[PDB]
Amino acid sequence: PLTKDPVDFVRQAAMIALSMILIQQTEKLNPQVADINKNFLSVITNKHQEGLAKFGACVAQGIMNAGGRNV
Amino acid sequence: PRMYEEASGKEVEKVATAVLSTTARAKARAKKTKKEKGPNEEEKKKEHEEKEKERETNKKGIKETKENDEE
Amino acid sequence: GCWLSSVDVNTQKSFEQLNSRAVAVVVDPIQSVKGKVVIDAFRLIDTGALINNLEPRQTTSNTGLLNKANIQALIHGLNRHYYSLNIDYHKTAKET
Amino acid sequence: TRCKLKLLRMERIKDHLLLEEEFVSNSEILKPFEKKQEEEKKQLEEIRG
Amino acid sequence: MVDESDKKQQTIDEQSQISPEKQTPNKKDKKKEEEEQLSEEDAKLKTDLELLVERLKEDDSSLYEASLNALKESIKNSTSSMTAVPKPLKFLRPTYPDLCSIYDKWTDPNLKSSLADVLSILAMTYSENGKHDSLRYRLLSDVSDFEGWGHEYIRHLALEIGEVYNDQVEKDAEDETSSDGSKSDGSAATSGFEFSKEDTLRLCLDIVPYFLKHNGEEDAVDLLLEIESIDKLPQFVDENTFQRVCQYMVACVPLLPPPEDVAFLKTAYSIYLSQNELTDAIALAVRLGEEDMIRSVFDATSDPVMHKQLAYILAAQKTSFEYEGVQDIIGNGKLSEHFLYLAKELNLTGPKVPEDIYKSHLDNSKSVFSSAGLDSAQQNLASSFVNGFLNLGYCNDKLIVDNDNWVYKTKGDGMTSAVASIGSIYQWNLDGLQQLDKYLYVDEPEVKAGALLGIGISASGVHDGEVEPALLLLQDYVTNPDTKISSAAILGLGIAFAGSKNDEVLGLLLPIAASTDLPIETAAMASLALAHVFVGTCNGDITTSIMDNFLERTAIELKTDWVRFLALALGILYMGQGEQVDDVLETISAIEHPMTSAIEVLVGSCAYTGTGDVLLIQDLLHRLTPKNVKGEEDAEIKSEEKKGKSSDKDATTDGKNDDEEEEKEAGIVDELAYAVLGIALIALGEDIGKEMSLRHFGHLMHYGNEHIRRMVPLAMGIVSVSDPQMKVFDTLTRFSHDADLEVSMNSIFAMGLCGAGTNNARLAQLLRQLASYYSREQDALFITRLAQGLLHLGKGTMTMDVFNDAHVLNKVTLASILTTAVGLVSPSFMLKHHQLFYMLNAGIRPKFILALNDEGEPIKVNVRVGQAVETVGQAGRPKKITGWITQSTPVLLNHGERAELETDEY
């Protein structure tokens, strides 16, 4: 619910939280992870996002697939 | 990684659905065309050869099976 | 609502010269009903800032949120002639 | 029955056909230009507010 | 409604609306107990039949459901339909409605489905008896009035239809499908269909066509012939019988593939041949286009009767009407063989009598000139062609031409075309040759060439009966080895004889159309004539043309112009046919080159015509593809490419025009809208594609015969003023020409504004001017139509040069072609044995009302007009004959056909 939260900065916090729990998990091992990376891609594509929403998607993906997908 | 680059597939999806939707608009005519079409294929060539058409090839309905390592 | 007219930009400009950083707090007290609404601070944007994109360095190293009281009125001067950033209130415990 | 069918055949197929082509082409108008007809649109939208 | 027992016969009916006692309890018990009650039951059938008849009038769903509820059970539960054999079989009369009461009166989705299937099986078994037919008849012609049967009776018939249609879609057929459970053929249901047909043809109309098209055989159609030809006059007039037959054929046009559709209309022709009117016959024989059928209707009047009589005069008139003149050649010389009079007969079949009649019309229509005065430079050239474009058909404007001052100032290619425009003043005329001769014997080779073209145009109206054939003049020119001379010669011969593929004309043209190794631009005309010659009648898809198209490709590619014209000649050649043309697509495709792929899409249109809706989707996938492939990636070649693109666009349009004409008249509206969405899609996507589609559009309209002419040409014109290629305007004006002075009032002002206003290049100005003059013939002199006129489904032959020229960027060379524009319509007149040149009276009506025919036979009410008036274009086409009140009888039914009226006075 916090992912879609109308308040902006709430959303910032939520995106980074999600990839932190699911840091480098296989996309067969969790269907979950594969959905979450595409969520990020669309946030940056879409121009009806706030600057704080854009900030959270980019950091979160960097965590998510951090270490060169090793850590 | 997984694929996340695309902006060339828009074209191919568009013309891919158009044709199938055209079949629906064309239907009224299509059936009279179809009555002609079937016997003309049985006599001649179905499409270059006429092997295996007894069902739709030799199977009917769903031809799929469930997986036990994926998802 | 809180906005600025041309005449008030001329007044603004000279406080900017006197003290490099300075603010303008604009009170509209008859669209105010919570003592806090329709009160914003404003500050000049330079002409250099628009054309060379050095305008949003004030969205960085702060909260990076702007809370609108008048959506229509702030947004108009937000690119034209000001940048708005949100206002906060304070007191010591003696005061409270 | 045969007289109605003959009219009904021609008017449904073409009109349904004209409909489907408008759908495909409408997207396809846009791609050729992107700075050759686009420019007039950008300048009007800004002046009009 | 309430029970009221057995006090009287009136209350017995009332008693059985809730619960029968003479159909339920008693009968049931008898059948489930004794089998001597089989005997009582047989007498009681009659009684039971009557009780239905009385309560038919009751409609309420509840008092038929429930009443006969237990009888429905009894079919399988207690009787099991074989406890006494014969006896349930003949006792199925009343049990068959019980089933229908659950299908239709009550709607329970589960039973309504299931019991359809039951109903089918039992319809068959009980039709052996031929009593299932009588069950059907008592509801079809009715005894009682209730809403119920008006919905019910359709279902009984629908059982038959169900099965028969499915045998085309699924191959397994018969009662193996459990969808009906009933055998497709056999001597048990076949006899049922014939009998069903009889009763439904008399009272209704619904199922008689459905049965034919589901069998799919020309055989169903030939049973129809037998029954209907009995009905021809004593049951109802000639007229009525005719309107049914063609309603069957015209309505199911789109869904008949090529071999099937020829095979059905054979039978409609023959139906017409049997019946009194031979007038209805000749019109279908023409549809088909087969030689074989023309000859039988012409023969049927000429050969029996020894005497001259009416019979010889009528044969000639009938063949005379097609101005393709394909009929003209065939019929000629029979007249010679019989020898009563050579002189009247031979001249009357010939289009020689059609010139004479033209003078009568011309006399009302008078001469008004409006030609350009502009002289010097390219403007001189413009004006001198414009003079011919205004005085098309037989006109006399001799004196102007004799002022050789303006003639001689033309230069280059303008000189050839100047002489060629002169020929069209004397278009469709014997006299005029003179004017041409002076130049042909003097100055540069250019004037000599231009003379031959004009001869071509003049000869359009005199080339039969061996009265100055064009063949005679032009042979000498073919021998002469100079290329300009020889090329010009065969272009005019081809034009004149039109469809006529006479031995001398054809065979002169046969060794030739076979040298393309030598590189010559103007040899487009080598094949281009022969294609023209070929249209109007069934094709051989001649081996001369097919060999030479390939050879040219081997030899050159340099002359882009040469090979684009060639490609079109092949497609125009196959016109007149479609069945045989499915073969040649493959043959052409065997050899594969990207250059050959341009030829194929063109030819596809002629093979698929007359069932095309697959063809349509195809000519649209093509369009998209250049752009589309590019689309995927983003997220010597010169000649081949250009041919590729350009071909497709021509092909899309040709396809459409031909389909809409033959198919539903409704569909004509929809196809224009689809075009507009095709062009819009192109204007954005490809810069180069846009150029071709503009030009194509004008001939889209003229071919398709759009109903609307006011709005659409004008609107389109305006956008395209900005847009380059002023050749656009010429293609629109050929549609707009219409009934001169209706549409064309708007037109001269609209085309004129852009021309007159803008002058920024004289090149540009020239196209605009010509377009303008073409459009109007002074005080409705004639009308041009792509169509035959004699059929409105019909397609012309002479108008195929117009249709060819809108595929290329404009050229001065092209101007020379453009002079040729032939495709006249005669004005009807009532003929007499002294050949009266005057119409008495006619009805005209903008719009037909009849909805039995999509063509719409004339109403008999109309709006009345005077003598000697042109047969009006659109919004006047329906034409009825007014003469009956003066005690005059048409011999030649005219519905707004090209044909001349003819009358017999008592």
From Swiss-Prot, chain A:
Coiled-coil residues: none
Superkingdom as given in the UniProt entry: Eukaryota
Post-translational note: N-acetylated by NAT1.
PC repeat locations: 13-50
Transmembrane segments: none
Summary of the function given for this chain in its UniProt record: Acts as a regulatory subunit of the 26S proteasome which is involved in the ATP-dependent degradation of ubiquitinated proteins.
Protein name as annotated: 26S proteasome regulatory subunit RPN2
Protein source organism: Saccharomyces cerevisiae (strain ATCC 204508 / S288c) (Baker's yeast)
Lineage: Eukaryota, Fungi, Dikarya, Ascomycota, Saccharomycotina
Gene of this entry: RPN2
From Swiss-Prot, chain C:
Residues that span the membrane, as ranges: none
Superkingdom of the source species: Eukaryota
Post-translational modification: N-acetylated by NAT3.
Binding sites annotated in the UniProt record for Zn(2+): 8
Comment field on protein domains: The JAMM motif is required for the deubiquitination and degradation of ubiquitinated substrates.
Summary of subunit composition and partner proteins: Component of the lid subcomplex of the 19S proteasome regulatory particle complex (also named PA700 complex). The 26S proteasome consists of a 20S proteasome core and two 19S regulatory subunits. Interacts directly with RPN8 and STS1.
Family under the similarity heading: Belongs to the peptidase M67A family.
Additional record remark: Present with 16400 molecules/cell in log phase SD medium.
Protein task: Component of the lid subcomplex of the 26S proteasome, a multiprotein complex involved in the ATP-dependent degradation of ubiquitinated proteins. RPN11 is the only catalytically active member of the lid and serves as the essential deubiquitinase of the proteasome.
Protein name: Ubiquitin carboxyl-terminal hydrolase RPN11
The organism of origin for this protein: Saccharomyces cerevisiae (strain ATCC 204508 / S288c) (Baker's yeast)
Residues of the full protein shown: 115 to 210 of 306
UniProtKB/Swiss-Prot annotation, chain D:
Domain of life: Eukaryota
Protein's cellular compartments: Cytoplasm; Nucleus
Role according to the record: The 26S proteasome is involved in the ATP-dependent degradation of ubiquitinated proteins. The regulatory (or ATPase) complex confers ATP dependency and substrate specificity to the 26S complex. Has ATPase activity.
Family: Belongs to the AAA ATPase family.
Name of the protein this chain belongs to: 26S proteasome regulatory subunit 4 homolog
Gene giving rise to this polypeptide: RPT2
From Swiss-Prot, chain E:
InterPro entries: 26S_Psome_Rpn1, ARM-like, ARM-type_fold, Proteasome/cyclosome_rpt, RPN1_C, RPN1_N
Ranges annotated as biased composition (Basic and acidic residues): 1-11, 24-34
Record PTM Phosphothreonine, positions in chain: 24
Superkingdom of the organism of origin: Eukaryota
Repeat positions for PC: 417-449, 450-487, 488-522, 523-563, 566-598, 714-745, 746-780
Protein's UniProt keywords contain Transferase: no
Modified residues (Phosphoserine): 16, 19, 178, 187
Coiled-coil zones: none
Region feature (Disordered): 1-44, 170-191
Low complexity bias spans: 179-191
Gene Ontology MF annotations: enzyme regulator activity; protein-macromolecule adaptor activity
Pfam family for this entry, one: RPN1_RPN2_N
GO BP: proteasome-mediated ubiquitin-dependent protein catabolic process; regulation of protein catabolic process; ubiquitin-dependent protein catabolic process
Key words, A-Z: Phosphoprotein, Proteasome, Repeat
Cellular component per GO, a single term: nucleus
PANTHER family in UniProt: 26S PROTEASOME NON-ATPASE REGULATORY SUBUNIT, 26S PROTEASOME NON-ATPASE REGULATORY SUBUNIT 2
Function in brief: Acts as a regulatory subunit of the 26S proteasome which is involved in the ATP-dependent degradation of ubiquitinated proteins.
Record family assignment: Belongs to the proteasome subunit S2 family.
Miscellaneous note of the record: Present with 306000 molecules/cell in log phase SD medium.
Protein known as: 26S proteasome regulatory subunit RPN1
Organism: Saccharomyces cerevisiae (strain ATCC 204508 / S288c)
